[PDB]
Amino acid sequence: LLLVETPIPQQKHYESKPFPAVISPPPALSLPLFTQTIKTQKHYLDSLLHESGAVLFRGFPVNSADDFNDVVEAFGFDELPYVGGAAPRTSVVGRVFTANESPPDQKIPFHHEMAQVREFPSKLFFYCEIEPKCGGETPIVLSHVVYERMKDKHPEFVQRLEEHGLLYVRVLGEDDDPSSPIGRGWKSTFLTHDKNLAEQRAVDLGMKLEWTEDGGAKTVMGPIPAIKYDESRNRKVWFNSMVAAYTGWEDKRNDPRKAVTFGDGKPLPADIVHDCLRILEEECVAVPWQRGDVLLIDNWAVLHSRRPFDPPRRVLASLCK
Amino acid sequence: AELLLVETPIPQQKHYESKPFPAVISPPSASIPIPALSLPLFTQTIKTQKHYLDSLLHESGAVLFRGFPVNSADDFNDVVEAFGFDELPYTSVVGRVFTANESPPDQKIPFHHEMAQVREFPSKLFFYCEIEPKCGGETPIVLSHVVYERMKDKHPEFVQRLEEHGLLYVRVLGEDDDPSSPIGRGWKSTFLTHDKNLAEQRAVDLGMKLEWTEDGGAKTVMGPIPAIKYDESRNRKVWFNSMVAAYTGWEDKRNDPRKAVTFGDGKPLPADIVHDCLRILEEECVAVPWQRGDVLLIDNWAVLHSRRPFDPPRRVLASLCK
Ligand SMILES: [Fe+2]
Ligand SMILES: [Fe+2]
Numbered sequence: 001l002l003l004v005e006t007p008i009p010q011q012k013h014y015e016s017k018p019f020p021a022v023i024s025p026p027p028a029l030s031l032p033l034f035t036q037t038i039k040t041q042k043h044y045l046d047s048l049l050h051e052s053g054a055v056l057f058r059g060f061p062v063n064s065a066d067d068f069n070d071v072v073e074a075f076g077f078d079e080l081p082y083v084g085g086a087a088p089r090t091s092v093v094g095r096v097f098t099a100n101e102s103p104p105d106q107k108i109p110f111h112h113e114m115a116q117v118r119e120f121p122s123k124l125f126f127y128c129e130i131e132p133k134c135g136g137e138t139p140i141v142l143s144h145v146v147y148e149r150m151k152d153k154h155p156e157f158v159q160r161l162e163e164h165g166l167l168y169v170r171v172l173g174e175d176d177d178p179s180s181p182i183g184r185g186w187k188s189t190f191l192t193h194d195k196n197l198a199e200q201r202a203v204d205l206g207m208k209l210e211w212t213e214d215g216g217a218k219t220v221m222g223p224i225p226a227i228k229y230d231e232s233r234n235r236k237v238w239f240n241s242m243v244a245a246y247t248g249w250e251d252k253r254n255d256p257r258k259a260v261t262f263g264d265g266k267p268l269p270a271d272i273v274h275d276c277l278r279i280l281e282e283e284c285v286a287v288p289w290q291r292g293d294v295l296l297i298d299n300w301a302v303l304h305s306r307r308p309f310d311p312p313r314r315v316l317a318s319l320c321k
Numbered sequence: 322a323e324l325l326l327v328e329t330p331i332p333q334q335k336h337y338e339s340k341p342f343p344a345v346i347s348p349p350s351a352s353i354p355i356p357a358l359s360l361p362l363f364t365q366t367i368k369t370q371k372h373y374l375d376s377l378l379h380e381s382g383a384v385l386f387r388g389f390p391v392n393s394a395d396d397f398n399d400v401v402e403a404f405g406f407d408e409l410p411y412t413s414v415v416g417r418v419f420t421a422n423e424s425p426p427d428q429k430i431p432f433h434h435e436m437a438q439v440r441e442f443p444s445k446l447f448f449y450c451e452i453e454p455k456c457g458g459e460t461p462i463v464l465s466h467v468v469y470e471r472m473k474d475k476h477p478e479f480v481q482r483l484e485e486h487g488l489l490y491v492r493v494l495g496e497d498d499d500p501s502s503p504i505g506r507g508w509k510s511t512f513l514t515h516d517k518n519l520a521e522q523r524a525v526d527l528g529m530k531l532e533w534t535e536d537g538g539a540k541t542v543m544g545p546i547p548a549i550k551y552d553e554s555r556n557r558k559v560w561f562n563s564m565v566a567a568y569t570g571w572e573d574k575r576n577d578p579r580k581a582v583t584f585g586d587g588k589p590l591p592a593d594i595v596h597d598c599l600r601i602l603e604e605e606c607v608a609v610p611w612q613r614g615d616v617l618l619i620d621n622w623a624v625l626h627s628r629r630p631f632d633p634p635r636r637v638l639a640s641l642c643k
Contacts, residue, residue, distance in 0.1 A: 064415040066394050088500065090422060092412040093394060129413075175497040178510045185500070193501040 001037045002026045020054035035074035053301035057294045068127040069094035072318045080319040102181045108306035109244035123320035128289040136309025139286035143237035165263035167222040171253035174215040180251040186217040223263025324366040325349045343383035364403035382623035386616040397449040401640045409641035430628035431566040445642035446619040450611040458631025463606040465559035487585035489544035493575040496537045502573040508539040545585025
């Protein structure tokens with residue numbers, strides 16, 4: 001079976017490279033034939049992900065969570081062991097899971113997966129088992145592009161970011177708020193109900209957990225870098241949750257404006273942060289999901305998000321070490 | 322190529338009026354000709370032996386299928402499709418098969434009929450062992466009509482009062498979802514809304530009375546509803562209720578299991594008699610150790626199930642029928 005590089009309307013190109021790269025089928029197709037081609041074309045696929053940063057596989061027989069798991073298995077990347085610092089996860093089969101995000105009417109900001117975690121995924125997979133009735137795409141953007149445009153537009157700001165970095169403040173409830181963009185409580189965050197084991201697992205993850213009165217918790221993280229270096233592609237990337245926090249960490253316990261600051265406490269310039277948001281939207285690519293679609297994302301080069309949608313919609317995921 | 326479905330004995334099974342519980346079907350030891358076992362051969366035999374299998378489930382209440390090539394969720398789904406029961410209208414693994422978010426492994430899940438407090442509950446249930454537990458983790462099952470007959474015999478007055486007033490179920494919900502709780506789901510998620518008006522309207526549709534607590538949560542009161550039902554297909558009364566389940570298993574920071582369920586008229590249940598019922602369930606139950614490939618078909622009108630504590634790994638998928 002052949003893996004054909006196919007053009008789609010939404011994709012962009014950077015230095016002659018498509019973003020995202022799109023592979024489609026040209027013996028009747030079957031899941032085993034696909035997973036077999038994946039193993040056979042390992043090198044080709046590694047080079048494609050290396051050049052593009054994300055690869056969308058469209059037109060293949062991935063009709064269930066089990067099929068998706070088999071495809072993830074064919075790529076052979078080591079699975080990311082679950083710890084904490086993420087959201088209420090629900091394992092479906094094997095390395096595949098469903099995480100409960102914010103409501104369909106909301107817009108999930110751009111971010112790198114588990115960006116504030118020490119051992120974050122190098123790669124992730126997204127699978128559409130049930131396409132959204134309307135909207136619900138998973139827009140993606142090249143992190144190094146965002147950095148380059150930011151350094152070009154706001155050299156001083158970028159310069160200050162690499163000197164002082166960023167500081168993150170996030171208040172947590174005891175339980176999980178299904179209605180919040182950042183509704184995970186400290187119980188689910190640290191997979192514990194004991195404050196001792198929590199405050200410890202918290203300090204380990206590199207946090208300053210101070211128990212709140214209403215049984216919640218106020219977490220503070222940083223200073224930590226805002227810019228990182230992709231060793232495999234020799235370039236710097238916008239690896240931070242600045243825009244995500246500044247515009248999305250909003251609920252009864254969190255004021256977005258105070259959710260993230262420069263590493264030295266100094267506030268961020270509202271106009272520059274929103275200018276960054278503008279760059280993310282302009283450079284992003286929002287491919288409408290089709291049932292069977294499997295998207296492979298290199299977490300070092302891409303930030304993802306989610307658009308509002310009308311149910312039904314079901315996108316499963318898988319994280320790689 | 323044909324396959325024989327042989328009624329086989331196992332150590333754990335019991336017998337009531339000459340009928341095995343659960344009935345156990347396995348491939349034969351030495352058949353002529355020797356059949357090459359496969360999933361497709363099994364699913365074909367299931368369709369071919371429809372009547373025989375319906376009769377078996379009818380007489381026993383539950384049927385364990387042991388020794389067949391059910392080696393994946395996909396295989397299990399094919400087996401569920403071969404039986405042709407209508408799927409119960411709604412984490413989905415494949416087709417009609419899913420994984421149930423159960424309690425932690427160290428816990429003991431109480432006996433219950435599936436979706437017992439739901440208007441349209443499943444008539445039948447399928448359980449499949451994809452990965453056998455390292456230790457324990459069986460799925461004990463017991464005959465509901467037997468529990469009823471023993472309860473009526475030991476506590477006639479109590480049963481008589483149950484038929485008269487029935488039971489009342491209480492749950493104090495928080496606004497958000499508590500992860501560390503067997504009943505931790507809040508009213509926002511339970512009623513899929515953050516709007517109080519809509520929520521209390523949806524609870525009423527579900528045959529529930531909702532009262533908004535002062536702390537931002539909610540208190541629901543379901544009932545009075547019957548504690549005893551009638552199995553039309555078998556002409557007998559069954560212990561179709563979550564009495565023991567709620568009285569001993571619905572505990573968290575907001576809920577006290579002793580007020581979680583009461584008589585339909587508010588009167589508390591006698592602790593002695595409830596624990597006596599718990600005793601009966603344990604004595605009458607059958608806990609068959611799970612084996613990879615096992616498929617258990619349960620008639621939800623005649624059987625209550627549970628789960629023993631266990632040491633991971635363990636993986637049992639499920640499927641519900643209209
Ligand atoms: Fe994400
Ligand atoms: Fe159950």
